[PDB]
Structure formats: C-alpha cells, structure tokens
C-alpha cells in the first residue's frame, strides 16, 4: 500500500481542506501558548470604584471573583441525585488552579519570596470561599469518577500546595460544623475505584499493538488511542496528593480527623482506606514481576507501566508518611494494627528480585533508579 499511496495533489479539494484543518489545529493552534488565567483572576478580584461612600456598607458585597465561587458553591449544594457534567465549572476550575502555582541554587531570600507569592495567589481564592467549594464539589460527586471530580481535586491541590495552614483550617472548620458524611463517603468510593496494574488488560494491548490497524480515509500509523492499563493513574496521584496536602505541615487536627470523625453519625477511616489501596497496588506489582520473571529483558511497554505504577506507589507512601508524621500517635497505632506490614513484606519481595533482575542489563538503568527511590 505504501507504493500505491495517493499523493496529496490527487485528492479532491474538500478532502484536502478537511485534512488541513486537522493538521493546522494540532500543529499551530494547540501548540500556541496563551496565558490568560493570571490576568483573568486579577481582573475578577478587583472591586469597582465603590469606595466613595465608606458607610456601614462594610458588609462588602462579593467581588466578581467571589460571586463566581458562590455560584459554583450554589450548584454543588443543590439536592440532586447525580452531579451533572458542567463544562463551565471545569473551565473556571482550571483557570483558578493555573493562577495559583505559576511555577540552580535558589538563595534564602527569594525562596521565601516564592512562598509568600504562592500564598498570596492562594489567598485570592480561599478568602472567597474556594476552599469550601472544593469540599462541596467532592461531596457532590458522591464517589463517581470523571472530569468534574478531577478538576476539583486539581484546584484543591493548587490552593493547598506548600501546606497552606490557613486553607487547611478553613477546610477542617467547614467539615466539622456541617458534620456531613458525604465528603468521606465520596473519598472512600473514589479510592475503591482507583485502578491498579491489570495483566489481562496489558496482554490485550500487546496483541492490539501487534495487529497494526489503519483507518479508511488515508492511513493512521498505529493510532495511539487511550491506554487501558492504569488509565486513571494521574487521577490516583492527585487524589492521594490532595489527602497528603490536608496533613502537610504536621496538621495534627486534620491527621486525627481523617482517622475518625467524632461529630459525624458514621466514621470512615481514610488511613485504613489508603492501606487497602496500597495492598491492591502491591499485589498488582507482584503479579507484574512474575509475568516478566521468566523473561530475560523487560520490553518498553512493560517498563512504562512499571514506571507509572511506581509513581503512584510513591504518592501513596508519601501520603501515609504525612498521616503519621508530627508524630500522630493515633495514626501510628492505626497503621500498626492494619495490613500495612503485609504490603511492606510484599514490596520487599518485589524490590529484592527486581533489583537483581534490572541490574543485569544497562538498558533498564533508568527503571532501576526509579525503583531505588521508591524503596
């Protein structure tokens, strides 16, 4: 078929134009960089020349940015069976998230300046109810994965980066006064839907990539449709990153609250739930090692799936570390009596055998480096 491929000048004009539009948007429109999140948030955070009266109006009606957060907080608190998909919320959640981070020997002076600049950008949101909105949206999804919850988690991480104590206090206060069980029920459900390494899915992909499929209108060179092995790995990382940031800075009050919610009618132990996912991830990694144990060299697709599994395992270990540091005696006792020891025993078996296997060929040195820091 290569030697009989039709040249572009023999195609009809309308067909060639359609191909041009697809090529132009991918190479020229998508690649274009336009940063407007900082400018948009700055414009919405300004009160408009209403300071010529300075009376008892000190109630200080919300600024345009504040009204935007209240509107999304309004639809999150609406009594509905399912949180319907909203592109407007997703678009603005990304805008708010992208406006808060904005980020080889950095000195002490500017290191603090970056932290203070980071705090100010986060302050523009959590002082306008953004911290409460994130919790409401998580509780509204009721444990259903999707673009809505993923956008909410990214926004929550954006305002919690660096261990923002002020945001943590606002989130903790809101949960304790409402005494709602939906937030942790949603979190627990999301963690149970997180995927691990599936060998059956991996085996199917290897056969699929060996067929070499093409399309009708032209010919696609091994189309790269969505990965089906740990497809939501990025979602899993931010879900545990969000939980880690709730305890960042050794917030003992939030560390105890994750283990037990005293005011709620029912209690969910998030600390134990994290260990449950770690066991499932560890078992999947152990199964993956046995699959390649007979084989002499791990091929490229296997190494990539190993790398993303280790990245998720790093976040879970970091999240567990943040739960107990400070130290939090209650969380330490909870982990001691949990199945964490079984997971650690399993990881040691995988670590010992993978180190010996990976060291036998220099083509897998990068994977070995990632394995070592995971240990």
């Amino acid at each position: 078929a290569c030697f009989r491929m039709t040249p572009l000048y023999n195609l009809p004009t309308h067909r060639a134009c359609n191909m041009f539009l697809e090529s132009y948007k991918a190479a020229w429109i998508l690649t274009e960089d336009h940063s407007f999140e900082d400018r948009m948030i700055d414009d919405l955070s300004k009160a408009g020349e209403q300071e010529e009266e300075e009376e008892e109006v000190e109630e200080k009606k919300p600024d345009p940015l504040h009204q935007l957060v209240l509107h999304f907080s309004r639809t999150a608190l609406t009594e509905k069976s399912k949180l319907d998909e909203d592109y407007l919320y997703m678009a603005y959640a990304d805008i708010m998230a992208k406006s808060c981070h904005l980020e080889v020997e950095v000195s002490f002076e500017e290191k603090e300046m970056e932290k203070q600049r980071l705090l100010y950008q986060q302050s523009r949101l959590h002082t306008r109810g953004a911290a409460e909105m994130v919790l409401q949206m998580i509780s509204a999804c009721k444990g259903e994965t999707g673009a809505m919850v993923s956008s909410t988690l990214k926004l929550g991480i954006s305002i919690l980066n660096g261990g923002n104590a002020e945001v943590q206090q606002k989130m903790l206060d809101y949960l304790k006064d409402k005494k709602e069980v939906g937030f942790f029920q949603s979190i627990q459900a999301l963690m149970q839907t997180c995927s691990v390494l599936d060998l059956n899915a991996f085996e199917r992909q290897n056969k699929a990539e060996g067929l070499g499929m093409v399309n009708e209108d032209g010919t696609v060179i091994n189309r790269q449709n969505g990965e089906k092995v740990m497809a939501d790995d990025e979602f899993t990382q931010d879900l545990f990153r969000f939980l880690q940031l709730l305890c960042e800075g050794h917030n003992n009050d939030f560390q105890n609250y994750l283990r037990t919610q005293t005011g709620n009618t029912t209690t969910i132990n998030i600390i134990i739930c994290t260990v449950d996912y770690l066991l499932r991830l560890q078992e999947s990694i152990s199964d993956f090692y046995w699959y390649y144990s007979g084989k002499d060299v791990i091929e490229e697709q296997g190494k990539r799936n190993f790398s993303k599994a280790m990245s998720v395992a790093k976040q879970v270990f970091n999240s567990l570390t943040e739960y107990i540091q400070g130290p939090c005696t209650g969380n330490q006792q909870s982990l001691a009596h949990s199945r964490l020891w079984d997971a650690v025993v399993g990881f040691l078996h995988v670590f010992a055998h993978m180190m010996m296997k990976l060291a036998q060929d220099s083509s897998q040195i990068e994977l070995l480096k990632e394995l070592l820091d995971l240990q």
Binding site: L77, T78, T266
Partner: protein, 387 residues
C-alpha cells in the same frame, strides 16, 4: 419474621431497633457485654423473641416476659459462664462501640446464637436475597453484627410512624363498625371515634411535612429539602401513604356530613368535613416534590380524578392532582380522554379557577418533554366550544 436483608432497607424505618435494658433506672447507661436486654422494633412496637412454636419471631408487648425476649451481646462465642454481673448505679464503663465492636447476639435463657438460615437453593432465581434469621446452638463464624447509630430525625420519624399507624388503624376499624349499620334514632352502638386525636394528629403531620419557606438561604433550604424527602420516603415505605388513602376511601362513601351523621351521629359528623380536608392536605404533603411517591398514582389515577367533583374538599383534591402531575412523567403517559374531560368539567362546574388551568398546563410538558396525546385532547375538548 426476622430477615437479613440488604439494599434500600438499610435506610428504611423497618430496620430500626431499640435496645432496652431490663431496668428503668440508668437504662441509658453504657451497654456491657453479657448484659441482658430486650430488642424492640420501633415502627411495629414488637420485641424480638424466641417462641417454642415458630422459633425466632417478634411478639407483642403482652408476650415479652423477660425469658423469650432477653438477649445479650457477646464479644465471642466461647462459653465463659463466669458470673452474673451486677449492675452499677451510673453510666458505667464504656465497652461496646458504634461500628467497631463485633457483637454476637445470644438468647440468654436458651443460649442460642442469632444467625441466618442458610437459604435453600432454587430460591436464588426468585431474587430473594433475604436470609431468614434463626436462633441456633452453633451458628457461623460471621454471626458478628455491627451496631450503627441512627440519626435523631429517623428515630423520631420511626416512632411517629408507630403512633400514627395505631391511631389511624383504630380510626379505620371504627368506621368499619358502622359501615352498613344505620344508627336510626339512637346511638351509633359502638366505641367513640378518636375524632379529636385524628384531627390533632393530622395537623401535626401537615406541619411536619411543610415545605421549607422560599425566603431561606440556598444552603439551609436544600438541607431542609433533603430532610423532607427522606421523611416522605420513610412514611411511604411504612404504608402511611396507603393508610391515608384507606381513611379517605371509607370517609368518601358518605356524600355529605348529614349522610355521615346517619351512621356516626351528629357529634362525629360535625368534624367530618374538617377531617377529609386534612386528609387530602396531608396526602399532598406526603407527595409534594417527591417523584417516587407521585409515581404510585400511575396505577390508581381514577381514584383522584373521580373525586374532583366532590364539594366538601374540592380545593384539597385539586391540589393533590396538581402535585402528582408536576412530578411524575409516568402519570402523564396514562392520561386518557375521560380524565381530561373530567378536569375540563371542573372549570364548567366550579368556575374560572386559574389552578385548573395550571393542572392542564402540567399535562402537556413535563421535564422538557411534550406529550402529543395530552395536547391534542386538551385542544379538542376545550378550545372549539369557546364557552
């Protein structure tokens, strides 16, 4: 009979139990392992019991004699049999936790363990996930039970259902006493109807199911709406909605208060019009804004429509019809020509009421979907007359 059931029953009122220790003073103290206590079903008022005939059942309060109805929670099935613990005059030491402690229920008198009946095969095809609860000498390893707290809203509602059901059943059987026995020139020849109790109970429930005011902020309004929907579902699942219909039906066989006076006397007939209006008002409150409750009328719609011409509660019945139509699209799909002609006849006989027009508007479009049959029938039977 007692079953192990899952699904929606975990949020219903028939899965609620009250633990009653065998004492009055300090009956609210912390529960202790091996402490005898009765287990009472809140909505029915019956007590878990062991009978020589049927085994494990729930019996009335007149048959709970501290021997068939004494149970205790034990941390393990080992036969400790150490000594009868003596109760203290106080709260005591806290032992059993909510949602963490695993409790084995043992019948004190017999020593049997609470477990399931190991359902016979060929019954799974019937969809029966329920496992009958039995008392057995050995039991199984998974007989441990978790005790989960119940919200004060649900606990109060379950007790209200128990009291409401008993009162209306007494009222219903009182009506059936003189169902076809005219009193003549004498007394109705029976116990007096609980007229004052029914009226007060209806008024309390109407205020219990009142929708939240529109002037509230969005946050608390949604919270009250969530509680209201939960309470409507709790009452409906216990047959309260069907109980109200039975009261209406038995009171609807009398065309007027004077006709009702011919069977229940004058002193009971002077409240006949008040009770029927309250019954329809309560019926509307039980279904207003609840699609699940409104969908129940997709099987009995002539029940509401045939009562539209009743003069004693014309406004109340119209409100009930309006609530059903604005919530349940299923009811709109069963609307027939005779139903629409009856609603149109309401304009002819009761005058130009804008609420009847709103009822007709709700028949056309529901949730952004239009019904052509309803639109054509309304147009055919209302417009060309020009009257």
């Amino acid at each position: 009979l007692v079953y192990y059931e899952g699904g929606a029953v975990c949020t219903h009122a028939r899965s609620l139990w009250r633990l009653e220790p065998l004492r009055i003073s300090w009956s609210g103290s912390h529960l202790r392992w091996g402490q005898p206590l009765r287990i009472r079903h809140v909505t029915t008022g019956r007590y878990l019991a062991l009978t020589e005939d049927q085994g494990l059942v729930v019996v009335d309060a007149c048959k709970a004699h501290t021997k068939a109805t004494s149970f205790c929670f034990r941390v393990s099935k080992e036969k400790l049999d150490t000594a009868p613990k003596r109760d203290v005059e106080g709260m005591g030491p806290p032992e059993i936790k909510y949602g963490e402690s695993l409790c084995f229920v043992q019948h004190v008198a017999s020593g049997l363990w609470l477990t399931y009946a190991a359902p016979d095969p060929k019954a799974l095809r019937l969809g029966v996930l329920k496992k009958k609860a039995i008392l057995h000498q050995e039991g199984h390893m998974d007989d441990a039970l978790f005790l989960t707290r119940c919200q004060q809203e649900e606990s109060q509602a379950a007790r209200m259902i128990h009291s409401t059901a008993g009162l209306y059943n007494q009222f219903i059987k009182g009506l059936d006493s003189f169902s076809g026995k005219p009193r003549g020139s004498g007394p109705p020849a029976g116990p007096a109807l609980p007229i004052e109790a029914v009226i007060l109970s209806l008024q309390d429930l109407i205020g219990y199911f009142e929708p939240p005011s529109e002037e509230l902020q969005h946050e608390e309004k949604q919270s009250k709406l969530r509680s209201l929907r939960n309470r409507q579902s709790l009452f409906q699942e216990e047959g309260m909605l069907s109980l109200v219909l039975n009261c209406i039906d038995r009171l609807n066989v009398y065309t007027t208060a004077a006709h009702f006076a011919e069977y229940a006397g004058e002193e009971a007939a002077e409240s006949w019009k008040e009770i029927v209006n309250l019954l329809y008002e309560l019926l509307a409150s039980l279904i207003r804004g609840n699609r699940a409750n409104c969908a129940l009328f997709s099987t009995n719609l002539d029940w509401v429509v045939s009562k539209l011409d009743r003069l004693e509660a014309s406004s109340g019945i119209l409100e009930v019809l309006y609530c059903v139509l604005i919530e349940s699209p299923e009811v709109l799909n069963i609307i027939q020509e005779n139903h629409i002609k009856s609603i149109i006849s309401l304009l002819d006989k009761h005058g130009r009421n804008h609420k009847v027009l709103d009822v007709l508007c709700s028949l056309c479009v529901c949730n952004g979907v239009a019904v052509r049959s309803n639109q054509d029938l309304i147009t055919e039977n209302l417009l060309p007359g020009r009257e």
